[PDB]
Design a binder for this molecule. Sequence first.
Ligand SMILES: *[C@@H]1O[C@H](CO)[C@@H](O)[C@H](O)[C@H]1NC(C)=O
Ligand SMILES: *[C@@H]1O[C@H](CO)[C@@H](O)[C@H](O)[C@H]1NC(C)=O
Ligand SMILES: *[C@@H]1O[C@H](CO)[C@@H](O)[C@H](O)[C@H]1NC(C)=O
Ligand SMILES: *[C@@H]1O[C@H](CO)[C@@H](O)[C@H](O)[C@H]1NC(C)=O
Ligand SMILES: *[C@@H]1O[C@H](CO)[C@@H](O)[C@H](O)[C@H]1NC(C)=O
Ligand SMILES: *[C@@H]1O[C@H](CO)[C@@H](O)[C@H](O)[C@H]1NC(C)=O
Ligand SMILES: *[C@@H]1O[C@H](CO)[C@@H](O)[C@H](O)[C@H]1NC(C)=O
Ligand SMILES: *[C@@H]1O[C@H](CO)[C@@H](O)[C@H](O)[C@H]1NC(C)=O
Ligand SMILES: *[C@@H]1O[C@H](CO)[C@@H](O)[C@H](O)[C@H]1NC(C)=O
Ligand SMILES: *[C@H]1O[C@H](CO)[C@@H](O)[C@H](O)[C@H]1NC(C)=O
Ligand SMILES: *[C@H]1O[C@H](CO)[C@@H](O)[C@H](O)[C@H]1NC(C)=O
Ligand SMILES: *[C@H]1O[C@H](CO)[C@@H](O)[C@H](O)[C@H]1NC(C)=O
Ligand SMILES: *[C@H]1O[C@H](CO)[C@@H](O)[C@H](O)[C@H]1NC(C)=O
Ligand SMILES: *[C@H]1O[C@H](CO)[C@@H](O)[C@H](O)[C@H]1NC(C)=O
Ligand SMILES: *[C@H]1O[C@H](CO)[C@@H](O)[C@H](O)[C@H]1NC(C)=O
Ligand SMILES: [Ca+2]
Ligand SMILES: [Ca+2]
Ligand SMILES: [Ca+2]
Ligand SMILES: [Ca+2]
Ligand SMILES: [Ca+2]
Ligand SMILES: [Ca+2]
Ligand SMILES: [Ca+2]
Ligand SMILES: [Ca+2]
Ligand SMILES: [Ca+2]
Ligand SMILES: [Ca+2]
Ligand SMILES: [Ca+2]
Ligand SMILES: [Ca+2]
Length: 540
Amino acid sequence: DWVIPPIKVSENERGPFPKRLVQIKSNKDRFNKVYYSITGQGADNPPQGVFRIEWETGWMLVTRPLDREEYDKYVLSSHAVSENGSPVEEPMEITINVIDQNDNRPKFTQDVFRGSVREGVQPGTQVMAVSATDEDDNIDSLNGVLSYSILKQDPEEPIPNLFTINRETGVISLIGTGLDREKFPEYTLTVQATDLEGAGLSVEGKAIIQITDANDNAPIFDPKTYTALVPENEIGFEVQRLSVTDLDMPGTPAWQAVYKIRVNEGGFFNITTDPESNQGILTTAKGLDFELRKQYVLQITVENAEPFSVPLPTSTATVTVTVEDVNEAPFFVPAVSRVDVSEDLSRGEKIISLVAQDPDKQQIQKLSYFIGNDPARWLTVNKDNGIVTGNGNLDRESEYVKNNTYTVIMLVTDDGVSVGTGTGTLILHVLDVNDNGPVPSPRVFTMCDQNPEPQVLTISDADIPPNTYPYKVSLSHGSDLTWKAELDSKGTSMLLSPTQQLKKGDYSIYVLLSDAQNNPQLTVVNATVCSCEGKAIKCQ
Ligand SMILES: *[C@@H]1O[C@H](CO)[C@@H](O)[C@H](O)[C@H]1NC(C)=O
Ligand SMILES: *[C@@H]1O[C@H](CO)[C@@H](O)[C@H](O)[C@H]1NC(C)=O
Ligand SMILES: *[C@@H]1O[C@H](CO)[C@@H](O)[C@H](O)[C@H]1NC(C)=O
Ligand SMILES: *[C@@H]1O[C@H](CO)[C@@H](O)[C@H](O)[C@H]1NC(C)=O
Ligand SMILES: *[C@@H]1O[C@H](CO)[C@@H](O)[C@H](O)[C@H]1NC(C)=O
Ligand SMILES: *[C@@H]1O[C@H](CO)[C@@H](O)[C@H](O)[C@H]1NC(C)=O
Ligand SMILES: *[C@@H]1O[C@H](CO)[C@@H](O)[C@H](O)[C@H]1NC(C)=O
Ligand SMILES: *[C@@H]1O[C@H](CO)[C@@H](O)[C@H](O)[C@H]1NC(C)=O
Ligand SMILES: *[C@@H]1O[C@H](CO)[C@@H](O)[C@H](O)[C@H]1NC(C)=O
Ligand SMILES: *[C@H]1O[C@H](CO)[C@@H](O)[C@H](O)[C@H]1NC(C)=O
Ligand SMILES: *[C@H]1O[C@H](CO)[C@@H](O)[C@H](O)[C@H]1NC(C)=O
Ligand SMILES: *[C@H]1O[C@H](CO)[C@@H](O)[C@H](O)[C@H]1NC(C)=O
Ligand SMILES: *[C@H]1O[C@H](CO)[C@@H](O)[C@H](O)[C@H]1NC(C)=O
Ligand SMILES: *[C@H]1O[C@H](CO)[C@@H](O)[C@H](O)[C@H]1NC(C)=O
Ligand SMILES: *[C@H]1O[C@H](CO)[C@@H](O)[C@H](O)[C@H]1NC(C)=O
Ligand SMILES: [Ca+2]
Ligand SMILES: [Ca+2]
Ligand SMILES: [Ca+2]
Ligand SMILES: [Ca+2]
Ligand SMILES: [Ca+2]
Ligand SMILES: [Ca+2]
Ligand SMILES: [Ca+2]
Ligand SMILES: [Ca+2]
Ligand SMILES: [Ca+2]
Ligand SMILES: [Ca+2]
Ligand SMILES: [Ca+2]
Ligand SMILES: [Ca+2]
């Protein structure tokens, strides 16, 4: 058909109501009276009564103002019946479009936006982002397009133009330079959005930016030069602690100190760090020792764990140390294999005039010499002059003496001012003299009767050679009660044989030898005889 165009109507209209929109006519009215009515939402349906028609003229009206924001369009159905009561025309659809008007102010997405950036970054860096909206049209008008802006950053210091915002997108960026967490950490700037691309109505928001941290700062010592005293030897011990103040953020690696000495003399120092006021705690690496050095001039520089965000001054601490003195024990010089001395020494004679030395050249402390180790008592010392003399009777020949030795240990004490011990061994070579003289091996026989065979006997000397070289056998009172002497060819033994057919048991034979001579006297080597033929038998 020839329909009927949609009807545009403005919003928030205002004048004298009613307002005729249009007029409709059924031509089938030649016959009876026609009754015009109309139906739909806004008509008889909810919102009832916005539009109504004059049953007799065919006029359509808007009865009151409208807000497209509420309902932006309506569709209606129109009718025409006869007085008799019958419909005449197939109904007719009707449309109305509600044209937008700038009745709406915009509104920010949130009531407050927050942001953060680091202090050392470069100009032209994107920080935050902000939103807002207008409910009016924005597809055929500007009643709903906004334009963003900024008008007041607080801390109007260092300067007041650190940022800008993209008018269309509302994004903010760092424009200037001079950000420092250490002086001004959080800005509060006021934003506004406007109707018709900055032309219409405006509103406010608030965005707040916190500033991350940077290693803008270096560490600073609170003393620059310290001093402490120290002892030579127990040690590995705490000398002095140090103080400092970095200014970036505390629990952070831009706040933790790292040290080191420049030069470690004997490399006898270690230094650690501590999460207190991360003071510098210095200590001794390997004890000290001395009388060698009293002075210690060393320097320690301090850094952070992480590198610096800028060239900065490295700052050292210069420190002086002094070693207190402890006084140590003295010592005999050697451990003496000294005196190759003979057995004939006169009880009270100079053996070893000895001396001991003591470390501490503070030496105005003497000591006393004491002896100590010990198989039995011979020797003697002058305690205030360390003089070892030889008292007593010695005898290389016999008991304690093991290999050609006699080892003895002695002491010495550090007095004068405190304490001390000195353990020193002393081996002294004893010597030989020909003391003893020759002696027979077996002392009792068992001779036989009829024809006894030679009674083997031998010789032994306690002395050391030559002193036991060859012999000379001799038979004293009974050199004839019949007894005849004899030597083995290979030196050592002697052959003892009677020369008479003598008696039934129990009787001695006086013996007498010599080796350089010395002559011993020996003696009786008794002789038990019991009935027989010729071989030395078990007796009775
Ligand atoms: C930003 O927020 C802080 C915290 O309240 C406030 O003290 C300051 O005045 C605001 N503006 C700037 C630029 O710091
Ligand atoms: C020396 O060391 C002591 C240790 O107690 C310290 O108090 C002092 O500051 C250091 N410097 C000087 C010059 O004494
Ligand atoms: C660190 O020590 C320096 C030296 O006096 C001082 O100026 C600074 O204020 C100290 N740091 C802090 C946080 O006080
Ligand atoms: C202190 O500094 C030294 C030197 O680098 C380091 O080895 C040590 O681990 C530090 N102490 C601590 C607790 O970090
Ligand atoms: C530390 O060493 C320096 C360098 O010679 C010296 O001036 C200072 O006296 C020493 N001790 C003290 C107490 O500073
Ligand atoms: C001699 O030194 C040795 C070796 O230590 C030791 O066993 C002995 O007791 C010391 N005295 C004598 C008399 O041998
Ligand atoms: C010296 O050392 C000895 C070790 O035999 C020890 O018994 C003594 O206590 C020490 N003397 C002193 C005066 O400290
Ligand atoms: C010295 O005397 C000390 C103190 O008893 C002792 O421990 C040490 O064994 C002794 N000997 C030596 C050779 O120092
Ligand atoms: C040997 O026997 C005699 C005879 O009785 C006795 O007098 C003597 O003591 C015994 N031994 C020695 C070594 O004299
Ligand atoms: C010093 O002492 C600390 C504590 O035991 C140890 O961990 C470190 O290895 C030593 N040496 C240094 C150079 O720090
Ligand atoms: C000083 O030395 C430290 C390393 O010990 C270094 O990191 C720092 O950059 C130096 N100072 C300067 C101005 O380069
Ligand atoms: C510490 O002080 C000494 C003496 O004044 C100096 O040699 C050293 O360089 C100083 N360290 C610093 C960082 O000034
Ligand atoms: C530490 O400071 C002293 C004096 O200020 C300086 O001479 C020295 O070069 C510094 N050490 C380091 C490693 O920077
Ligand atoms: C005494 O000192 C000597 C060093 O000549 C050593 O060989 C010996 O073990 C020491 N004896 C003791 C008990 O100290
Ligand atoms: C005696 O001398 C020998 C040879 O020098 C030596 O090796 C030994 O130790 C000493 N004493 C003993 C019991 O062997
Ligand atoms: Ca409206
Ligand atoms: Ca509107
Ligand atoms: Ca608007
Ligand atoms: Ca800074
Ligand atoms: Ca720092
Ligand atoms: Ca910082
Ligand atoms: Ca010493
Ligand atoms: Ca000392
Ligand atoms: Ca001493
Ligand atoms: Ca002897
Ligand atoms: Ca001897
Ligand atoms: Ca002999």
